[PDB]
């Protein structure tokens with residue numbers, strides 16, 4: 173299926189390559205570039221409506237860009253020093269900073285959105301929500317077999333609303 | 347299907363975002379960063395599509411006649427909460443009988459490695475023998491998408507092959523423009 177392949181590719185082609193190196197990048201930030209410490213783990217936003225905006229402070233003013241984590245580079249598929257950039261956000265609650273974390277959307281969910289827009293994709297809008305849930309479920313299943321990746325990320329699946337409160341609820345468990 | 351979604355995602359999530367900005371990056375390289383005495387880096391991203399789904403990280407390892415020259419200047423863009431998400435691409439010299447025969451931006455379509463990995467992992471529910479058919483479907487879907495996106499189709503070339511000289515495969519495509 174479409175979402176089954178997308179989740180396997182998101183893991184093989186991305187998470188598997190950044191998650192084993194993430195702890196060291198956060199530790200390095202907290203020691204030399206950082207206010208309280210940035211939390212560990214990549215917080216992955218999984219909007220089931222497949223709406224992936226480019227700016228997070230636009231989705232919620234209580235999510236404020238703080239800094240970029242130091243870049244990871246690696247030779248990848250003929251791309252010498254392929255760069256992996258990730259962003260740190262402050263999470264506000266009633267004007268106070270309530271958490272700090274590395275946050276981003278799972279970009280393959282935007283593929284489901286675009287395929288439901290384009291006739292040639294042969295993918296209906298009526299099948300999109302089921303595919304979004306299957307993408308999240310497959311990703312959860314893969315991570316359950318990859319400890320080095322599972323402990324370095326948190327999956328934030330939601331249907332619409334306060335995005336910062338959704339992230340904070342997950343953050344307040346570690 | 348798996349390869350149908352992978353090709354749509356490779357386009358939506360990557361090619362659609364880099365191909366409209368590629369010509370300017372190559373022009374900028376040729377004008378300010380290219381060794382003054384060398385010929386211009388060719389236009390277009392040359393995308394390697396090995397139907398065996400073998401995606402090595404080092405190209406000079408796959409063929410010594412493919413030699414790393416330089417990185418193209420980076421493209422940055424705010425993407426899905428990643429402020430200044432970086433797109434890096436590499437320039438290669440293609441040698442023929444010890445001489446330079448071509449210079450181009452070259453890389454493998456990384457979703458083909460997903461097909462390889464899925465054919466290995468039992469939880470992926472992807473049989474080992476399904477690889478080739480899925481790799482061909484990935485290439486055919488990518489060709490179909492690009493045929494509807496002129497701003498992308500003119501900025502890339504698809505190099506699909508079954509094994510051998512990888513440099514000769516690239517040169518054959520290069521020698522048409």
Ligand SMILES: COc1cc2cc(C(=O)CCC(=O)O)sc2cc1OCCCOc1cc2sc(C(=O)CCC(=O)O)cc2cc1OC
Pocket residue numbers: 177178180181182183185186248251254279280283351352353354355356357358359360425428431456457460
């Ligand atoms: C190779 O497969 C995948 C690679 C991949 C890379 C990703 C990211 O860098 C996350 C941020 C972003 O999407 O820009 S998210 C991501 C997800 C992947 O699998 C989903 C299905 C295929 O769709 C995409 C293909 C690519 S290739 C690419 C590159 O930067 C080329 C170099 C490389 O693979 O490291 C980005 C994508 C994104 C895809 O879907 C969103």
